[PDB]
Amino acid sequence: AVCPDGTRVSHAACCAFIPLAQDLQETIFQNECGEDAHEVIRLTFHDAIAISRSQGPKAGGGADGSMLLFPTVEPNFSANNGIDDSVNNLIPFMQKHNTISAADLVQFAGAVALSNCPGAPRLEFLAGRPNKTIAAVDGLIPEPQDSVTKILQRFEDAGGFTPFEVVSLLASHSVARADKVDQTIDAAPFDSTPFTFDTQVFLEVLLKGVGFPGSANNTGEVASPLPLGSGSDTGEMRLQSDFALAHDPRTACIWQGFVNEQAFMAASFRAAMSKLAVLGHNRNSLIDCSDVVPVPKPATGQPAMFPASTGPQDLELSCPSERFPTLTTQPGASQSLIAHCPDGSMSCPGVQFNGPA
Ligand code: HEM
Ligand SMILES: *[C@@H]1O[C@H](CO)[C@@H](O[C@@H]2O[C@H](CO)[C@@H](O)[C@H](O)[C@H]2NC(C)=O)[C@H](O)[C@H]1NC(C)=O
Ligand SMILES: [Ca+2]
Ligand SMILES: [Ca+2]
Ligand SMILES: [Mn+2]
């Protein structure tokens, strides 16, 4: 087909997503892998995972836009703390681009947001999800303090995800920060390159922890290897769950396998996301609008490296059957501060709308 902008799309139904992509970029993303983009990528996951095979349809419909359709319900569950911001930022587009369902909107937005992160893959995007569903039940969102067994069971029950797919999905923590784990500090990065979709997170979680970014008494948080922060440049935080998955016999080798394996990591994430994005739907009933997802930003192609002040001596390895690669170390005696803004500064407030959530 061909859209009113000359763009030759696959199916005429996909044409509506072109104006939406432009509006999302211009209004809330500004073509960067920033705060607003990160929040949306997280929403994509919280919307999709609220489904349960064992409990049945009444428990939740998966990737159905329930967070937007029932804004006063799920956003208020403990495990969803902080999701309100992404919901309120997306509602205005729902009302505007009213030919696209809340569910399609959520998934597409995440695909657009991710394309702003260098190294991220171009996600598959299928459209046609219904604009009607039910509010999900509490307890279907995995938490930081959960054990590996509980986590793996949750993903299996949601959509038959194997442990390999679960680890692959955590590649998103390479462009993630925390605002609610510790209430004394904001935007504490999970890896040293929070604006880059690379393998640093897999490497950095394997390093010995030496301190904490803020308080040392937070549920679901463990010692970080790069806690130093000054002003707005908050230090790195480490989640119990990420730590646990990096050292459990079931997932240890998978986790290590992604260190310095950029192409493998990106492809595995794309694969796992294809499944996640259609939870609660039959993919044979959705149209393929992938050619409408923006081309992602390319990476520089540099290998993973130990950040300044850490080295091979600081690794806590758990995979006995695979050789850890030889990586270089960035020069310096002390830890460098992790930039709060992608441009380098400390002042870069994102757009935020008031809403019902
Ligand atoms: C065992 C599974 C997971 C757990 C327990 C978990 C936990 C968390 C926690 C505690 C935060 C901090 C939020 C805050 O306090 O502000 C976070 C952030 C985030 N997570 Fe996860 N996560 C999991 C899986 C995923 C998956 C599968 C995705 C998506 C594909 C994802 C994407 C994100 C993103 C992008 C953020 C950052 C939001 C921002 O920087 O504003 N997470 N996660
Ligand atoms: C999907 O459902 C939502 C929720 O009912 C619809 O949102 C309304 O859209 C109109 C314009 O079409 C706005 O004036 C309303 O205020 C919206 N309601 C809310 C609560 O936000 C949306 O239009 C529906 N879209 C589709 C494609 O079915
Ligand atoms: Ca949902
Ligand atoms: Ca990163
Ligand atoms: Mn945040």
Cβ 207 under 6 angstroms from ligand 2: no
Give the H/E segment covering residue 178.
Answer: strand 177-178
- In 3D space, the residue among 95, 110, 66 whose CA is nearest the CA of residue 280 turns out to be 66
* Same domain assignment for residues 22 and 80: yes
The answer to the question of whether 157 is labelled as a binding residue is no
Q: Could you tell me the CATH number of the domain that includes residue 178?
A: 1.10.420.10
* Same domain assignment for residues 279 and 246: no
Q: Which residues neighbour 117 within 8 Å (Cβ) at sequence distance 6 or greater?
A: 33, 37, 175, 195, 196, 197, 296, 297
DSSP class of 39: H
Burial 331-344 (b: 16+ CB within 10 A, else e): eeeebebbbbbbee
Q: Which residues neighbour 183 within 8 Å (Cβ) at sequence distance 6 or greater?
A: 215
* In contact, 167 and 245? CB cutoff 8 Å: yes
CA distance to 176, 177, 214, 339, per residue, from 192 (Å):
10, 10, 16, 9
* Same domain assignment for residues 171 and 194: yes
245-248 LR contacts (CB < 8 Å, sep 24+): 245/148, 245/151, 245/166, 245/167, 245/170, 246/202, 246/205, 246/206, 246/318, 247/316, 247/318, 248/148, 248/318
- In 3D space, the residue among 100, 163, 170, 85 whose CA is nearest the CA of residue 131 turns out to be 100
Q: Could you tell me the CATH number of the domain that includes residue 287?
A: 1.10.520.10
Residue 221 pairs in a beta bridge with 239
Cβ 131 under 6 angstroms from ligand 2: yes
d(CA 141, CA 77): 9
Type of residue numbered 283? R
Q: Which method was used?
A: X-ray
d(CA 170, CA 108): 19
Domain membership flag for residue 4: no
* In contact, 42 and 35? CB cutoff 8 Å: no
Give the H/E segment covering residue 267.
Answer: helix 262-276
* Same domain assignment for residues 236 and 332: yes
User: Among the atoms of ligand 2, which is closest to the Cα of residue 96?
Assistant: 11
Q: Which domain holds residue 164?
A: 142-272+302-342
User: How many Å separate Cα 153 from the centre of its chain?
Assistant: 20
Give the H/E segment covering residue 107.
Answer: helix 102-114
Angle of helix 35-49 relative to helix 102-114, nearest 10 degrees, comes to 140
* In contact, 154 and 54? CB cutoff 8 Å: no
d(CA 113, CA 107): 10
* Same domain assignment for residues 111 and 211: no
What's the Rg (C-alpha) of the chain? Answer: 20
User: Among the atoms of ligand 1, which is closest to the Cα of residue 273?
Assistant: 30
Cβ 98 under 6 angstroms from ligand 2: yes
The answer to the question of whether 343 is labelled as a binding residue is no
The total of other beta-carbon atoms located within 10 Å of residue 67's CB is 28
What is the per-residue DSSP string for 213-249? SS-S--TTEE-BS----BTTBPPP-EEHHHHHHHHST
Q: List residues near ligand 1 (CB under 6 A).
A: 38-39, 41-42, 45, 82, 142-144, 151, 169-170, 172-173, 176-181, 239, 241
Looking at the chain, how many residues does it have? 357
The alpha carbon of 186 and the centre of ligand 3 are apart by a number of angstroms equal to: 26
Q: Which residues are marked as active site?
A: 46
Instruction: Give how many domains the chain has, as a whole number.
Output: 2
User: Among the atoms of ligand 1, which is closest to the Cα of residue 143?
Assistant: 5
What is the three-class DSSP state of 161?
A: coil
Domain membership flag for residue 60: yes
Tokens encoding 236: 């790195």
SS (H, E, C) 286-315: CEECHHHCCCCCCCCCCCCCECCCCCHHHE
d(CA 240, CA 143): 9
Q: Which of 40, 42, 47, 221 to mutate to test the pocket of ligand 1 (most atoms within 8 A of CB)?
A: 42
- Within 78-136, strands assigned E span 126-127
d(CA 325, CA 256): 10
* Same domain assignment for residues 155 and 46: no
* Same domain assignment for residues 146 and 136: no
Tokens encoding 46: 């919280």
CA distance to 248, 295, 305, per residue, from 1 (Å):
49, 19, 46
